[PDB]
Amino acid sequence: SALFEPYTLKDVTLRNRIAIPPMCQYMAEDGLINDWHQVHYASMARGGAGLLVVEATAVAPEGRITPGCAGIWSDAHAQAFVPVVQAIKAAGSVPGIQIAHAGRKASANRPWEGDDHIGADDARGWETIAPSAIAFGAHLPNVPRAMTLDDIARVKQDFVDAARRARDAGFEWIELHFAHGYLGQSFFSEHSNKRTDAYGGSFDNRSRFLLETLAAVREVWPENLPLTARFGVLEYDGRDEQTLEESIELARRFKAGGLDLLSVSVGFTIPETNIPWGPAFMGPIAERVRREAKLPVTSAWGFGTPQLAEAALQANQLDLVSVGRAHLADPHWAYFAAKELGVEKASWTLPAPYAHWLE
Amino acid sequence: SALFEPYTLKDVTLRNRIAIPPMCQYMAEDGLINDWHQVHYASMARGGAGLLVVEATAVAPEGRITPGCAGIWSDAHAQAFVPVVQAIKAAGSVPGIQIAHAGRKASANRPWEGDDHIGADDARGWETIAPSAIAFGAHLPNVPRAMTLDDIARVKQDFVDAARRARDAGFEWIELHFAHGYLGQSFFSEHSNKRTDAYGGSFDNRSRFLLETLAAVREVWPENLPLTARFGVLEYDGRDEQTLEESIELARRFKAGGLDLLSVSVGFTIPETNIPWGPAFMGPIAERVRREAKLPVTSAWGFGTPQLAEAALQANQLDLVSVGRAHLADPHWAYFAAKELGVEKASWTLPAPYAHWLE
Numbered sequence: 001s002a003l004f005e006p007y008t009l010k011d012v013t014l015r016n017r018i019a020i021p022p023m024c025q026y027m028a029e030d031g032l033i034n035d036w037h038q039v040h041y042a043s044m045a046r047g048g049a050g051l052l053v054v055e056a057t058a059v060a061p062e063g064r065i066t067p068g069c070a071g072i073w074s075d076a077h078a079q080a081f082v083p084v085v086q087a088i089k090a091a092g093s094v095p096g097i098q099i100a101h102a103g104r105k106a107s108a109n110r111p112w113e114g115d116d117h118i119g120a121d122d123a124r125g126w127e128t129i130a131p132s133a134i135a136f137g138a139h140l141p142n143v144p145r146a147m148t149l150d151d152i153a154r155v156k157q158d159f160v161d162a163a164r165r166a167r168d169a170g171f172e173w174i175e176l177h178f179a180h181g182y183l184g185q186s187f188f189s190e191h192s193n194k195r196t197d198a199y200g201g202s203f204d205n206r207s208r209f210l211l212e213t214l215a216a217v218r219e220v221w222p223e224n225l226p227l228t229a230r231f232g233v234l235e236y237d238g239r240d241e242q243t244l245e246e247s248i249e250l251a252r253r254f255k256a257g258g259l260d261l262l263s264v265s266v267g268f269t270i271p272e273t274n275i276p277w278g279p280a281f282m283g284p285i286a287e288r289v290r291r292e293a294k295l296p297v298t299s300a301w302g303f304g305t306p307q308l309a310e311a312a313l314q315a316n317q318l319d320l321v322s323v324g325r326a327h328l329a330d331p332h333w334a335y336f337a338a339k340e341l342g343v344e345k346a347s348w349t350l351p352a353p354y355a356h357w358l359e
Numbered sequence: 360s361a362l363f364e365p366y367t368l369k370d371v372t373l374r375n376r377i378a379i380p381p382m383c384q385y386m387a388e389d390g391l392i393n394d395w396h397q398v399h400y401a402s403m404a405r406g407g408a409g410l411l412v413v414e415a416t417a418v419a420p421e422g423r424i425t426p427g428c429a430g431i432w433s434d435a436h437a438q439a440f441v442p443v444v445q446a447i448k449a450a451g452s453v454p455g456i457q458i459a460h461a462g463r464k465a466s467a468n469r470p471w472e473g474d475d476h477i478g479a480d481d482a483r484g485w486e487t488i489a490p491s492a493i494a495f496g497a498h499l500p501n502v503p504r505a506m507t508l509d510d511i512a513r514v515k516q517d518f519v520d521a522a523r524r525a526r527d528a529g530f531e532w533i534e535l536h537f538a539h540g541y542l543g544q545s546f547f548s549e550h551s552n553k554r555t556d557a558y559g560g561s562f563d564n565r566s567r568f569l570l571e572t573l574a575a576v577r578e579v580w581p582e583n584l585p586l587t588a589r590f591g592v593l594e595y596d597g598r599d600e601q602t603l604e605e606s607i608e609l610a611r612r613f614k615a616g617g618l619d620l621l622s623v624s625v626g627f628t629i630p631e632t633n634i635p636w637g638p639a640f641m642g643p644i645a646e647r648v649r650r651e652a653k654l655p656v657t658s659a660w661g662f663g664t665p666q667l668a669e670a671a672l673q674a675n676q677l678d679l680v681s682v683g684r685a686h687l688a689d690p691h692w693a694y695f696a697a698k699e700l701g702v703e704k705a706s707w708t709l710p711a712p713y714a715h716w717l718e
């Protein structure tokens with residue numbers, strides 16, 4: 001089974017091609033993770049996945065999506081992750097983390113508490129920042145303040161400090177969150193970036209925040225550990241041909257800047273889109289990026305069906321298959337997949353106290 | 360769905376009829392549980408089961424099955440269980456524990472390390488105790504030391520001490536392990552008990568160790584928390600009609616002695632048996648015990664198929680369905696069962712950070 005072939009990138013070897021993508025839990029308090037996360041992550045790692053990327057973790061307080069989001073903006077926050085790293089490693093999985101800034105989509109309620117921007121009179125809210133003072137719209141109507149040059153420098157340094165802290169907590173894999181309409185994505189998109197300074201108004205200028213942040217992180221992130229990013233390569237906004245071409249060119253510049261792997265996603269930059277959700281629908285898009293930018297890739301959205309994951313690998317569309325919601329449903333999904341694909345000794349995807357009895 | 364009806368027994372209410380039965384993990388060191396257990400139990404509790412009975416936990420060091428078995432024979436051992444108890448409760452499940460003494464089946468290898476009695480050369484082994492100096496045979500050839508009256512008094516007191524410790528650790532449900540050929544089962548069975556004193560040679564005498572231990576525990580276990588036991592009611596040894604009659608009579612005596620619920624199992628007292636393993640095969644046996652002894656029951660062995668579990672409840676064969684190995688495979692099995700049975704808002708079997716996204 002292709003799904004259960006190991007993968008080596010820089011000095012890291014994953015025991016199979018199953019990645020658990022970052023999935024926000026909205027259970028942290030003041031950015032500090034806790035027993036929710038400890039058990040959540042440890043149990044999924046014991047489930048058999050080769051790589052577990054911890055949820056979007058804010059580089060600064062205002063870069064949380066919600067009051068429940070994890071953060072890594074202090075040494076105390078980083079220390080909270082050490083036992084998560086240790087539990088993921090002890091299970092034989094590789095610990096990664098996605099570092100993030102929610103930009104104009106920040107200061108929102110948890111998804112089961114409205115999923116919408118926090119109102120001005122709710123004291124839990126905060127002012128958001130973005131390239132330009134333009135709201136997302138729909139359920140996120142709050143207008144962000146347009147970043148100053150000093151804001152840009154500060155946020156870049158927060159990404160650097162977050163990467164340093166992740167490194168020192170023991171993570172072996174980092175992912176910069178430049179997707180899903182949050183701050184990085186919103187610098188790249190002409191929908192959200194109307195700046196006329198060095199950070200807007202041309203392809204080079206829109207790319208600048210992302211490339212400068214990558215370069216700054218590259219200085220502190222060890223060269224022998226995968227340096228990755230998530231990036232929305234189209235929006236399904238009627239501009240897909242031009243947007244995909246620019247996105248692939250940016251991916252080439254990411255490669256030139258030392259990026260080891262790209263997690264290929266959708267922009268979600270604006271609500272006025274027509275995204276064709278369906279099983280493995282990203283597969284052909286990820287393949288195009290992989291081939292044209294000559295970069296390893298992962299993608300997601302529907303690969304909880306083991307045969308879809310296997311097919312995508314065999315077709316050389318992906319190097320790793322990210323499986324999210326199926327692992328919320330079943331933390332041992334990798335074992336389920338091993339069985340479904342007829343892997344020999346499938347139960348030994350799990351640790352012995354389970355594997356012995358499930359043989 | 361009958362499976363998702365709450366259940367009340369004494370002061371304890373379970374949110375559904377799914378019990379996770381005790382399942383040895385063989386991961387403790389000198390009886391002390393650790394991060395293996397913490398994550399294992401917390402993750403299953405979050406999976407939705409209403410009751411989680413912690414694995415056979417030895418009342419004394421020589422009462423472990425293996426060098427990896429959990430113990431509760433000191434206050435330090437009991438303190439180690441507190442975070443397990445609390446994590447189970449935090450998840451909305453009820454924490455229980457099975458307290459145990461492996462008798463002549465003690466001093467064995469872990470199941471994936473031979474599953475057999477520890478060899479004489481091997482320095483991990485220990486002397487076993489039993490009602491009579493008779494070996495189980497087959498892969499468990501070690502001859503145990505026959506217990507004196509002073510030994511019997513000591514072991515009963517160890518069970519009492521264990522129950523007090525379990526109480527103070529915060530368990531809300533206790534199960535005395537009088538099944539599966541360990542010490543309690545072996546006092547009841549004429550195969551293993553050849554004593555000629557007050558503890559063997561008649562039905563009353565063979566029952567005595569079990570009734571005295573129950574009565575002793577009842578003195579320290581809170582009256583408002585379920586007091587339960589697991590008991591093998593037949594062996595499939597060609598003596599089933601007589602054995603089942605005696606077992607059901609002892610169940611009546613357990614009820615008269617304050618037992619709140621009986622977990623009905625098989626004896627496993629000797630290897631010379633022919634057990635007809637199959638889906639839900641214990642259902643009719645448990646039903647007969649429930650009906651004839653007029654006591655609530657649970658049973659196990661095959662109910663990982665949600666429809667089998669539901670059917671057993673609707674037939675009034677069981678009050679709780681114990682589902683073991685399916686929870687090793689999938690710690691969120693209770694959610695899987697809710698979906699399979701078409702429960703409304705089935706995903707809210709799980710905590711919000713999962714449920715929201717799975718509906």
Ligand SMILES: Cc1cc2c(cc1C)N(C[C@H](O)[C@H](O)[C@H](O)COP(=O)(O)O)c1[nH]c(=O)[nH]c(=O)c1N2
Pocket residue numbers: 021022023024025055056098177179180230300301302303304322323324325326712716
């Ligand atoms: C609960 C939850 C939370 C998040 C997500 C999703 C879900 C379900 N996803 C998107 C996720 O990584 C993945 O791309 C999608 O879930 C699609 O893959 P599946 O179809 O679920 O396997 C996500 N994406 C990301 O880049 N960072 C994150 O922190 C989050 N958080």
Ligand SMILES: Cc1cc2c(cc1C)N(C[C@H](O)[C@H](O)[C@H](O)COP(=O)(O)O)c1[nH]c(=O)[nH]c(=O)c1N2
Pocket residue numbers: 353357380381382383384414415457536538539589659660661662663681682683684685
């Ligand atoms: C890993 C493991 C460990 C144990 C068990 C089984 C397994 C699989 N079982 C028996 C268990 O409680 C249950 O009766 C059986 O697993 C049958 O139910 P299932 O078919 O697995 O749902 C068990 N029984 C018991 O009374 N105390 C225990 O500690 C153990 N330990």
Ligand SMILES: NC(=O)C1=CN(Cc2ccccc2)CCC1
Pocket residue numbers: 024056179180
């Ligand atoms: N931190 C992120 O990148 C998030 C991505 N989301 C997109 C999504 C859309 C549909 C289904 C799941 C996720 C929402 C949750 C947080």
Ligand SMILES: NC(=O)C1=CN(Cc2ccccc2)CCC1
Pocket residue numbers: 383415424538539
């Ligand atoms: N502590 C106990 O009561 C145990 C029960 N077992 C019986 C069993 C037989 C077949 C399959 C699973 C469990 C073996 C493991 C430990």
Ligand SMILES: [Ca+2]
Pocket residue numbers: 127128142143144145
């Ligand atoms: Ca504002």
